[PDB]
Design a protein around this ligand. Structure first.
Ligand SMILES: [Cl-]
Ligand SMILES: [Cl-]
Ligand SMILES: [Cl-]
Ligand SMILES: [Cl-]
Ligand SMILES: [K+]
Ligand SMILES: [Mg+2]
Ligand SMILES: [Mg+2]
Ligand SMILES: [Mg+2]
Ligand SMILES: [Mg+2]
Ligand SMILES: [Mg+2]
Ligand SMILES: [Mg+2]
Ligand SMILES: [Mg+2]
Ligand SMILES: [Mg+2]
Ligand SMILES: [Mg+2]
Ligand SMILES: [Mg+2]
Ligand SMILES: [Mg+2]
Ligand SMILES: [Mg+2]
Ligand SMILES: [Mg+2]
Ligand SMILES: [Mg+2]
Ligand SMILES: [Mg+2]
Ligand code: NA
Ligand code: NA
Ligand code: NA
Ligand code: NA
Ligand code: NA
Ligand code: NA
Ligand code: NA
Ligand code: NA
Ligand code: NA
Ligand code: NA
Ligand code: NA
Lengths: 237, 194, 92, 56
RNA sequence: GCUUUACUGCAGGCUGUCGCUGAGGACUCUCACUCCGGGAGGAGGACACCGAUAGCCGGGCA
RNA sequence: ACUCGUACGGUCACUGAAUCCUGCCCAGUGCAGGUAUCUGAACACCUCGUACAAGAGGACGAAGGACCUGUCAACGGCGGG
RNA sequence: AAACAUCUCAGUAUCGGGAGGAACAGAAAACGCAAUGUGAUGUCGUUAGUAACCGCGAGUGAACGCGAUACAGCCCAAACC
């Protein structure tokens, strides 16, 4: 049997790779020696082809010009600050410890220094619940209670572009255009429509999977399709 | 009485005990950041080195060589292969890690030829061996009775022909008696059955 | 069928007719040191191993009598041919 | 559209050109590697034992 | 060529154990080793990774 | 590779616009969770044995299974009297 | 092998690296016609399709020794300077 489509992806051929050369920049926080002195101005508001969300262009004191992840409510001319003693204003990036409890935050660091990792997409946000000298418990958009090093920086506010998901694509044409600007193969042929040779759900006199859809975690790649290690399925119950 | 060498040689009989063990745990740290083929100025095991051919002369070079630990990094068969030849993990090469080291080294130093080699430790994911090479184009050695022979043309690229000491040991040419039926005078003239 | 425990039959050892006790041959243990037990560990490797990959065959509808006939005086036993008996219960 | 006669018409791309090393028209100007002598891939002339019979 | 609860295998996943590997049936610590950090240092810590072995699964493959 | 990506995500599958709806079955098969007890390999540990070794036996016991639960918009089912 | 998985084809075909005019091997931690015996290594003849291996199936298959060819023997390490 030939390799299934999921295996082709792993090679990282052109068809599957993301259009990097077309992308703008990796949105990371600013590395400050210390002091918190670092502050800049919002020059413009652009659209990041990589996240479909907006982005803010900023110019600091020391000459630095770097595009940053634009939360909601930031405009041209405004002022942002990066550091330990930064003001608690929307957009200002600072460690979790300095941030008061119950405030919506985005672009949270998974480890201090990495430059952000959590809460980055359209209109999402984390939630700072607890404080300690050792821990800092954050509520990630998925609802999980992430325990974090209070030294990890995070931006105040919710990510802009909220409400994108709300309106349907309406037509194949529009989806096509979204996907072209991503490293995803599109469209998608259901494995049950393929031949016996091309995918486990293939073949048969009609369209149906011969094997039960759920499948073990331990299964080798090439067979790992369908409902993976499902803790259950359906909605009923 | 016992020479200074005999101490180094004894210390190395149990590299996990005493001062040597305290030494290994140190160096190894610095050894893991070092490249594959590194030229060191002096033999770690001076005794063994000398006992293999080492001399503090011009044209005598030493070097440490680090190799990944393991079994056959053999790729799985793509075409039809019966159950017996279906191995990838288990089967191992017929060439020992020490010999692999000698080659990586001889290559790194093209013009030089390989005298001998010896182990100098190993951790959980690599083994080290030092290598004694000689510059057969240097008058010091062309004139040195004790090493002269290495210049002979028919000694060129010897490590690759298995002519090392570690080579003959790998080829099963130790005992001149029983067992050597299939190895002497060479593996190829015996149809490769050892 | 039924078969008595002790009965007077001829023993090929002392050379005469005396009382013979009938006992069922009990399986003696394997050492794991025989030649077939050293070849199993030898010939076995990657993939198929030939005969060592052969699992137990089968059963016949009725087994023959596997017995030992131990005499009373000398104490020696003798193996005799077997007949197809579904069950063999001794009397006393 | 047949792969035959009709698809012969587009064939006007250049590929194998005169190899500087061996002198054959086997220098793939898109790969810059010779199919014959191997110039561009190996410093050693490409040669295989199957270019002739086994006992030869 | 394809399939499977056909025979025998193999990758692969899970798991015990061996080594890497150190200090005082549950626990502390740091020095190996890991990761982040430009650095100072931060996090993990004899675990993880990797080499060996053992049992289970194993048409993804032969 | 995905990824200059971070759950309003990207992966894996099924169904295939809107509209009205989508019943009952977890027995079997599958996946997932638990599990007193039961089953369960090798090293180390014990006895036996061998001046050593082969080998016999004991104790402990992981994943897995037995056993219980969950789950069908999971494979699939929805009869006879 | 009258299928076929060990086995066979076969360490063959093919691939990677390399030397010379020839290569390789080589002066016993050897042989074990057990001896009061032989005395580096190739190669030729023989031992011999013998011993040994093998779903003990098909098939695979040496050595010591003898008879010849050609013969040849050496140097470090360390002790002590
Ligand atoms: Cl999408
Ligand atoms: Cl060499
Ligand atoms: Cl009986
Ligand atoms: Cl003789
Ligand atoms: K075969
Ligand atoms: Mg990034
Ligand atoms: Mg949707
Ligand atoms: Mg794409
Ligand atoms: Mg589709
Ligand atoms: Mg079709
Ligand atoms: Mg299939
Ligand atoms: Mg259908
Ligand atoms: Mg269907
Ligand atoms: Mg096997
Ligand atoms: Mg890194
Ligand atoms: Mg098949
Ligand atoms: Mg020869
Ligand atoms: Mg047969
Ligand atoms: Mg053979
Ligand atoms: Mg002999
Ligand atoms: Na199907
Ligand atoms: Na060389
Ligand atoms: Na052999
Ligand atoms: Na053997
Ligand atoms: Na076919
Ligand atoms: Na059921
Ligand atoms: Na069920
Ligand atoms: Na045949
Ligand atoms: Na056939
Ligand atoms: Na004789
Ligand atoms: Na066989």
């Amino acid at each position: 049997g030939r390799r299934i489509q999921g295996q082709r992806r792993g090679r990282g051929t052109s068809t599957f790779r993301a259009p990097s050369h077309r992308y703008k920049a990796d949105l990371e926080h600013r590395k400050v020696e210390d002091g918190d002195v670092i502050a800049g101005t919002v020059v413009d508001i652009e659209h990041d082809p990589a996240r479909s969300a907006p982005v803010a262009a900023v110019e600091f004191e020391d000459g630095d010009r770097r595009l940053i992840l634009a939360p909601e409510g930031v405009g041209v001319g405004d002022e942002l600050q990066v550091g330990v003693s930064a003001e608690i204003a929307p957009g200002n990036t600072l460690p979790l410890a300095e941030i008061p409890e119950g405030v919506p935050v985005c672009n949270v660091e998974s480890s201090p220094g990495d430059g952000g990792k959590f809460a980055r997409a359209s209109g999402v946000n984390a939630q700072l619940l607890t404080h300690d000298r050792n821990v800092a418990v954050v509520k990630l958009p998925s609802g999980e209670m992430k325990r974090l090093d209070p030294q990890c920086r995070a931006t105040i506010g919710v990510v802009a572009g909220g409400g994108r998901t709300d309106k349907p694509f309406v037509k194949a044409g529009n989806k096509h255009h979204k996907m072209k600007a991503r490293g995803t193969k599109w469209p998608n042929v259901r494995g049950v429509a393929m031949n016996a040779v091309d995918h486990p759900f293939g073949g048969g006199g009609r369209q149906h999977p011969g094997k039960p859809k759920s499948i073990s975690r331990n299964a080798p790649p090439g067979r790992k399709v369908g409902d993976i290690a499902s803790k259950r399925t359906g909605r009923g119950g | 009485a016992r020479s200074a060498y005999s101490y180094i040689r004894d210390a190395w009989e149990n590299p996990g005990d005493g001062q040597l063990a305290e030494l290994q745990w140190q160096r190894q740290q610095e050894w893991r950041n070092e490249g594959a083929v590194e030229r060191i100025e002096r033999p770690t095991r001076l005794d063994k080195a000398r006992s293999q051919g080492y001399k503090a002369k011009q044209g005598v070079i030493v070097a440490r060589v680090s190799v990944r630990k393991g079994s056959a990094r053999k790729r799985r068969h793509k075409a039809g292969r019966r159950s017996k030849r279906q191995g990838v993990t288990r089967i191992t090469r017929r060439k020992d890690i020490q010999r692999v080291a000698e080659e990586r080294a001889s290559r790194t130093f093209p013009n030089l030829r390989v005298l001998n080699s010896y182990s100098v430790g190993q951790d959980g994911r690599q083994k080290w061996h030092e290598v004694i090479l000689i510059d057969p184009n240097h008058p010091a050695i062309q004139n040195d009775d004790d090493l002269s022979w290495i210049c002979a043309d028919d000694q060129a690229d010897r490590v690759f022909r298995g002519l090392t000491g570690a080579g003959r040991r790998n080829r099963g040419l130790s005992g001149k008696g029983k067992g050597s039926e299939k190895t002497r005078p060479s593996l190829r003239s015996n149809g490769g059955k050892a | 069928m039924q078969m008595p425990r002790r009965f007077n039959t001829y023993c090929p050892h002392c050379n005469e007719h005396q009382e013979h006790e009938v006992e069922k041959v009990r399986s003696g243990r394997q050492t794991g040191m025989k030649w077939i037990d050293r070849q199993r560990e030898r010939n076995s490797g990657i993939g198929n191993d030939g005969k060592f990959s052969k699992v137990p065959g089968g059963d016949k509808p009725t087994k023959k009598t596997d017995l030992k006939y131990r005499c009373g005086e000398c104490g020696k036993a003798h193996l005799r041919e077997g007949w197809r008996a579904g069950r063999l219960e001794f009397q006393e | 559209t047949g792969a035959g006669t009709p698809s012969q018409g587009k064939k006007n791309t250049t590929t194998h050109t005169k190899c500087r090393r061996c002198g054959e028209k086997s220098y793939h100007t898109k790969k810059k590697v010779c199919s014959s002598c191997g110039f561009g891939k190996s410093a050693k002339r490409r040669d295989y034992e199957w270019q002739s019979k086994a006992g030869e």
